């Protein structure tokens, strides 16, 4: 019901001590000491990092500095490294089984760039192709707006029909990502020698193919 | 290894009824040892919590689904229930079966609680296929990734399902039209592309698409060629047998195949005797062909070339050996001993002046006495102010075994020199 | 321009009727101004003569063909008449219509006769498309050439039937099966072949086939690279900007795109200023590629490469700006005047010896006093004997300039020395 | 009906002189000094070189003297050249407008070596795959005896039907030469990327192509 209260961001230099808090509701942080700090690393479910207030298990180092003062919980990641930047947040108990869990403090080293992976091209199988049938495709993965657009060529020229290009969202690091389809039959395809796909996304424009040509 | 999986799907419209279940194969609990949890993300948020239940007696659940949900066990079964009664407008979540260790770590897949009746239809495919350009230590990855599916579960297979050894199936997607796509790479050795089969092969159940694709790197090799001299005494010996020679080297080991063409004059000679063999030098090979000369036809000032054609050659590299026009010029042949600071030295150096010459058809030498001489250097030489040629010549010697009196012969073998040879000679 | 061009064919049987004929246009005669002519040749046999006639008024025929052959004309209509009655199983040949100027050489197309029905059905095309490997001087031949027909002639027209320079439709051939193939080729410039587009365009009308098709050469290019120093003034000079450079020479013109890569350390730099340039050279370019460099990474022991990649390169050149492993050495700088023999010569040469060194980073020099001198070669060092590095220096003079007392002065600019420069010195 | 009766062959060096001869009919050598020698290079009809006993026009040279002595006339070609291997023979009237003419006499230099021209391979015309059809050939120019074989292969291995391959004789140099053809349809063109052809001539067997390859 409760959320547990977390300063929204915090930064460090490199060489600096970092310092988090986590506010309770008292059947979980006041009540008993175990409170439970957590590093989350997206692509993933959360590690244990600190529980118990500065009770830690093994792998993790000496760095770790977690407790609780009042029913503003702590932790602090002294010495900082490049290796730091995740999802950090508090939990506790609550009594019999249940316990509440916070609302997360995004850590970050000083200072901020950008990056980019992958749009590709593939025909179709020899699961299809037997009973009458071609279907090719256009991926346009990972990215951070929602809005890409996709445009196909076949002999280099615009095409118009049978083309079901839709709408970008989220992933398991929380990029949006896209899909497209063109269908035809053996037959058409085995007349096309080419078949070229141009995706956009926020001026970030494309025509893409990492082919070094199509023969043989 | 655990699995945990949902099921009870589809899409329904609020004031009546459904029963979310997820069951268990790897690890033992439910509810006896630990805890289960229940999560909710709608489309465009994160995750809630939604209940929570104990070893057996002790369910609570979300004020917003408080005195509303039921989050119940079949421990014997090992099985999970969720079993509910008006998920209005805005519970339409992506609910999933949460195993706890200390706090919501095991992932199941889920099943989605969705909202007025749905269909099913159609994935493909896309392979990640490599760059090239290189990225640090014994590392390379490729790929496989799936497109533009509805329901969800596939099975996305590496070389038929076999080499999950350096593999991220990297994760899914729930797109803004309601659509999915996903990757699938392969993380192994560098060298071990090219020099073997890799395939993404999919497979989906839901509609009937299945799929499979391969791989390959790159790295250097382009050859390289060259046109030798008949030596003078073979030319000036009516006895001896001269012969002109094509060295094509840099050949390589995946493009061996270096043919030939061969011009005395303009009218192809075709053959004489014309020999090539390739051997296994250092990781490629060295190719010498072979011409035989009748010595006049050299001195009747005759053009000659060789018109190497390898595959690795896009384009044929041709030469032509090619004498020079003229000036006289024989050797102005004068060897010079030290500046007299080297009696200071363990170790003096010796001189030997081949200026005032053309061709740049030289072949200088050094002695010591009727044996030769280890160490030496020798310019290859720079065409001069008044229109001719010059170098010079080293001998790198003892001043310990100078004052001994040593008869060092500076032997040339440069041309329009009496002997096809002249030694000037040098002592103190 | 003439024709003569014959009718009436077709295969029959021995004891009835046949009347073959010969129409021409652009020449004057039948009869009237010279005389005519009609052969015959068996199938595996050669030419025989079967009658003649005159201006009008005198036709004799062969002793097989006598009694037997009537030849006669049709002056006013300009046609030929060979009416005969009994030809009988060997008579059977191929029957040309002959115009005589003093012996029989003006050939007709003419018409076969033949014994007992016959058919006719279709053809087809052959390119002759030309071999790279040169035939002497500016000649270059191509062609086309037609196979499997039944009735002959045909229509082989080339690059749609326009370009008759350098043209030799090649005579044709009635096979033992009795079928037919014939040639037909283009002898125009070498240079022209690439440079233009040529195509076979055939027809047949007695059947319904008709086609078109091209011709390309060959010839030299496939690049080299190169990676250079930074200047070492540049490097131990805090304020002064030092520089790794790779040069991609011999590029072509029909294949520009040089792409780089560039590896400070093993870890891509990518970036830094890599500046290239693409300008006209010879006939192919220069590409000059740019990297930046802050002295120090140099000096902290740094590995760097140039990893050229260009498309006439089926792979990447790969080059490493390695320095090498070590012996201390400073060069054994002593330069050295001449053997006293040379006073006996206008011209006198002077030596500089740069023995003892470890790196192969070698910029000696000379001079006259303060302004440079242009004679002089230097030997680009031999890995000497106890494992150092050794090299000589020329400065080609004249003895009445070195006696009028000139202060020649061997500049070196060569490493574990002092200045990054050390000069010896020398004169009489 | 007569044949002039010629020296069935003539040899000669290069530096020597080689005379040839021809043995009339009355109304023919014998009868009048119209007597023609002529040289006849195989590609195409005779040229002139002397009629009317020694009587030669223009462009022809110095070298040719030819006459008659008897009824045997005469035709020498002193200091010979590699141009004048050629097909000789006389000739001659018989009144009024007709005349008998040569049974040849073929000249040589002293001593002779082998040659061989061109098997190339061609697909179909667009003239004929509008209408569907794909008719290709396999060509066998040239060669000296009447028998030579072919066969094809299509993605490198045997074949058994639809092709014609059919027997060899003479040109207009007096060489024999060949034919062939398989017939498919677009589609079967169409799936098909190679069509190599293999001939055979007595020994001298054949697997061909001047291309470097198929592609785009
Ligand atoms: C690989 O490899 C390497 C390394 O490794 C190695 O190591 C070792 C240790 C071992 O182990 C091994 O095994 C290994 O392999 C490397 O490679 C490399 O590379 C490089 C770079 O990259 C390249 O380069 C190139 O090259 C060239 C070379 O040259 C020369 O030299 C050297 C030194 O000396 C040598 O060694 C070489 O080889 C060469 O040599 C030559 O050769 C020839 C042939 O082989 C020879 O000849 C001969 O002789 C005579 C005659 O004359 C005799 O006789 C013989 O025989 C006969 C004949 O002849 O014929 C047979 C007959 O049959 C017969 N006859 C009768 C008559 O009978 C007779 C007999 O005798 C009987 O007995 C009688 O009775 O005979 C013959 O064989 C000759 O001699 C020699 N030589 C001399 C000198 O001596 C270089 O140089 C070059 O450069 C160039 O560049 C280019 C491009 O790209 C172009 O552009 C041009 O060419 C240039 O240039 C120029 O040019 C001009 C004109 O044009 C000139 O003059 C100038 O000067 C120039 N300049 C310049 C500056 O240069 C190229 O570059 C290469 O490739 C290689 N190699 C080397 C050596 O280097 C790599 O890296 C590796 N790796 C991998 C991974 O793979
Ligand atoms: C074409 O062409 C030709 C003829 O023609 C001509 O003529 C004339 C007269 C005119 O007309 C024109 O136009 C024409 O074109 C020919 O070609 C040729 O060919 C050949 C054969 O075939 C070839 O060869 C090759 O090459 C190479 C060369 O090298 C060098 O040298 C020379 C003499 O010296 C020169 O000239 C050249 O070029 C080169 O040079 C160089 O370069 C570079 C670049 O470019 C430079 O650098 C620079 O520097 C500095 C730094 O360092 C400066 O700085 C600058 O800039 C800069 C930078 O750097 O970076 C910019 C920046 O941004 C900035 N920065 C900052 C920091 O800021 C800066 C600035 O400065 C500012 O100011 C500051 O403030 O900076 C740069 O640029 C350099 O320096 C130079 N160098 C020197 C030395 O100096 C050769 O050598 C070679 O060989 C090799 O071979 C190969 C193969 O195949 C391989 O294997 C290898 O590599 C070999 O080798 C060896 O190696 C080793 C190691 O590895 C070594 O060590 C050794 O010794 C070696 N050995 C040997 C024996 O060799 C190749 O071969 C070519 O290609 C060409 N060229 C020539 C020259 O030769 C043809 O034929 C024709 N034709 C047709 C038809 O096309």
């Known amino acids: 019901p409760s959320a547990l209260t977390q300063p929204p961001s915090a930064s460090g230099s490199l060489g600096q001590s970092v310092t988090i808090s986590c506010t309770g509701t008292?059947?979980?942080?006041?009540?008993?000491?175990?409170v439970s700090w957590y590093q989350q690393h997206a692509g993933k479910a959360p590690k244990v990092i600190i529980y118990?207030?500065?009770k830690r298990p093994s792998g993790v180092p000496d760095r770790f500095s977690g407790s609780k003062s009042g029913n503003t919980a702590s932790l602090t990641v002294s010495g900082l490294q490049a290796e730091d930047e995740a999802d950090y947040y508090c939990?506790?108990?609550?009594?019999?089984?249940?316990?509440?869990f916070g609302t997360g403090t995004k850590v970050t080293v000083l200072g901020q760039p950008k990056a980019n992976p992958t749009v590709t091209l593939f025909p179709p199988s020899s699961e299809e192709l037997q009973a009458n049938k071609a279907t090719e495709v256009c991926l346009i993965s990972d990215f951070y707006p929602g809005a890409v657009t996709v445009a196909w060529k076949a002999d280099g020229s615009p095409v118009k029909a049978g083309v079901e290009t839709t709408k970008p969202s989220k992933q398991s690091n929380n990029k949006y990502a896209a899909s497209s389809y063109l269908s035809l039959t053996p037959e058409q395809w085995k007349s096309h020698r080419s078949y070229s796909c141009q995706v956009t996304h926020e001026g970030s424009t494309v025509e893409k193919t990492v082919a070094p040509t199509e023969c043989s | 290894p655990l699995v945990l999986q949902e099921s009870g799907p589809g899409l329904v419209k609020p004031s009546e009824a459904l029963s979310l279940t997820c069951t268990v194969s790897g690890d033992s609990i439910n509810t006896i040892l630990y805890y289960w949890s229940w999560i909710r993300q709608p489309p465009g948020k994160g995750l809630e919590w939604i209940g929570y239940?104990?070893?057996?007696?002790?369910?609570y659940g979300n004020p917003s689904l408080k005195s509303r949900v039921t989050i119940s066990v079949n421990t014997s079964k090992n099985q999970f229930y969720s079993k509910l009664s008006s998920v209005t407008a805005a519970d339409t979540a992506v609910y999933y079966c949460?195993?706890?260790?200390?706090?919501?770590?095991?992932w199941g897949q889920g099943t989605l609680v969705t909202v007025s009746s749905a269909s099913t239809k159609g994935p493909s495919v896309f392979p990640l296929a490599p760059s090239s350009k290189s990225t640090s230590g014994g590392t390379a990855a490729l790929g496989c990734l799936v497109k533009d599916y509805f329901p969800q579960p596939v099975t996305v297979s590496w070389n038929s399902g076999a080499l999950t050894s350096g593999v991220h199936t990297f994760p899914a997607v729930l797109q803004s039209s309601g659509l999915y796509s996903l990757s699938s790479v392969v993380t192994v050795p560098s060298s071990s592309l090219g020099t073997q089969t890799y395939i993404c092969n999919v497979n989906h159940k839901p509609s009937n698409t299945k799929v499979d694709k391969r791989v390959a790197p790159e790295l250097l090799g382009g050859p390289s060629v060259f046109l030798f001299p008949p030596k003078p005494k073979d030319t000036l010996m009516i006895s001896r047998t001269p012969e002109v020679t094509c060295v094509v080297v840099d050949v390589s080991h995946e493009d061996p195949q270096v043919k030939f063409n061969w011009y005395v004059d303009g009218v192809q000679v075709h053959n004489a005797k014309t020999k090539p063999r390739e051997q296994q030098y250092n990781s490629t090979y060295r190719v010498v062909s072979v011409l035989t000369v009748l010595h006049q036809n050299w001195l009747d000032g005759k053009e000659y070339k060789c018109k190497v054609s390898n595959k690795a050659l896009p384009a044929p590299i041709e030469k032509t050996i090619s004498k020079a026009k003229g000036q006289p010029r024989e050797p102005q042949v004068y060897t010079l001993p030290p500046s007299r600071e080297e009696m200071t030295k363990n170790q003096v150096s010796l001189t030997c002046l081949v200026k005032g010459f053309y061709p740049s058809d030289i072949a200088v030498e050094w002695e010591s006495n009727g044996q030769p001489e280890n160490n030496y250097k020798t310019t290859p030489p720079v065409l001069d102010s008044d229109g001719s040629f010059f170098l010079y010549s080293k001998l790198t010697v003892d001043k310990s075994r100078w004052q001994q009196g040593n008869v060092f012969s500076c032997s040339v073998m440069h041309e329009a020199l009496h002997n096809h040879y002249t030694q000037k000679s040098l002592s103190l | 321009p003439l024709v003569l061009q014959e009718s009436g064919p077709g295969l029959v049987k021995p004891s009835e009727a046949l009347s073959l004929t010969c129409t021409v246009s652009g020449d004057s005669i039948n009869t009237i101004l010279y005389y005519w002519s009609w052969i015959r040749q068996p199938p595996g046999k050669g030419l025989e003569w079967?009658?003649?006639?005159?201006?009008?008024?005198?036709?004799?025929?062969?002793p097989s063909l006598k009694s037997r052959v009537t030849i006669s004309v049709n002056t006013s209509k300009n046609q030929f008449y060979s009416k005969l009655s009994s030809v009988t199983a060997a008579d059977t040949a191929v029957?040309?219509?002959?115009?005589?100027?003093?012996?029989?050489?003006?050939?007709?197309?003419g018409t076969l006769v033949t014994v007992s029905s016959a058919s006719t059905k279709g053809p087809s095309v052959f390119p002759l498309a030309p071999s790279s490997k040169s035939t002497s001087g500016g000649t270059a031949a191509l062609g086309c050439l037609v196979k499997d027909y039944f009735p002959q002639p045909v229509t082989v027209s080339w690059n749609s039937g326009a370009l008759t320079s350098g043209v030799h439709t090649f005579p044709a051939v009635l096979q033992s099966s009795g079928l037919y193939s014939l040639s037909s080729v283009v002898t125009v410039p070498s240079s022209s072949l690439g440079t233009q587009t040529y195509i076979c365009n055939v027809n047949h009308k007695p059947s319904n086939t008709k086609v078109d098709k091209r011709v390309a050469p060959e010839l030299l290019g496939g690049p080299s690279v190169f990676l250079f120093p930074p200047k070492p003034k540049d490097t131990l000079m805090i304020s002064r900007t030092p520089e790794v450079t790779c040069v991609v020479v011999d590029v072509s013109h029909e294949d520009p795109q040089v792409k780089f890569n560039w590896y400070v350390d093993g870890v891509q730099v990518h970036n830094a200023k890599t500046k290239p340039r693409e300008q006209q050279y010879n006939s192919t370019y220069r590409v000059v590629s740019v990297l930046t460099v802050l002295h120090q990474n140099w000096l902290d022991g740094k590995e760097y490469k140039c990893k050229v990649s260009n498309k006439a390169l089926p792979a990447p050149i790969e080059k490493t700006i390695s320095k090498a492993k070590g012996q201390p050495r400073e060069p054994q700088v002593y330069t050295l005047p001449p053997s006293r023999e040379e006073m006996t010569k206008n011209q006198v040469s002077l030596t500089c010896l740069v023995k003892g060194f470890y790196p192969s980073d070698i910029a000696v020099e000379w001079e006259s006093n303060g302004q440079p001198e242009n004679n002089y070669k230097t030997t680009p060092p031999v890995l000497d004997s106890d494992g150092s590095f050794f090299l000589y220096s020329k400065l080609t003079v004249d003895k009445s300039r070195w006696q009028q007392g000139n202060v020649f002065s061997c500049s070196v600019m060569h490493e574990a020395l002092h200045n990054h420069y050390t000069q010896k010195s020398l004169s009489l | 009906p007569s044949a002039l009766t010629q020296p069935p062959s003539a040899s000669g060096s290069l530096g020597q002189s080689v005379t040839i001869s021809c043995?009339?009919?009355?109304?023919?050598?014998?009868?009048?000094?119209?007597?023609?020698?002529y040289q006849q290079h195989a590609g195409k009809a005779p040229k002139v070189?002397?009629?009317?006993?020694?009587?030669?026009?223009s462009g022809v040279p110095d070298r040719f003297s030819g006459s008659k002595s008897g009824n045997t006339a005469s035709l020498t070609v002193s200091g010979l050249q590699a141009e004048d291997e050629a097909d000789?023979?006389?000739?001659?009237?018989?009144?009024?407008?007709?005349?008998?003419?040569?049974?040849g006499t073929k000249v040589t230099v002293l001593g002779q070596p082998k040659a061989n021209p061109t098997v190339t391979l061609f697909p179909p015309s667009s003239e004929e795959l509008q209408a569907n059809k794909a008719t290709e050939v396999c060509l066998i120019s040239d060669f000296y005896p009447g028998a030579v074989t072919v066969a094809w292969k299509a993605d490198g291995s045997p074949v058994k039907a639809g092709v014609e391959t059919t027997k060899p004789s003479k040109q207009s140099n007096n060489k024999y030469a060949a034919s062939s053809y398989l017939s498919l349809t677009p589609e079967q063109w169409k799936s098909h990327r190679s069509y190599s052809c293999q001939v055979t001539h007595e020994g001298s067997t054949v697997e061909k192509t001047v291309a470097p390859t198929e592609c785009s």
């Open positions: 118990e207030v500065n």
């Open positions: 239940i104990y070893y057996s007696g002790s369910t």
């Open positions: 939990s506790s108990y609550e009594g019999s089984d249940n316990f509440v």
């Open positions: 949460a195993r706890v260790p200390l706090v919501v770590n095991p």
């Open positions: 008292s059947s979980d942080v006041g009540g008993y000491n175990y």
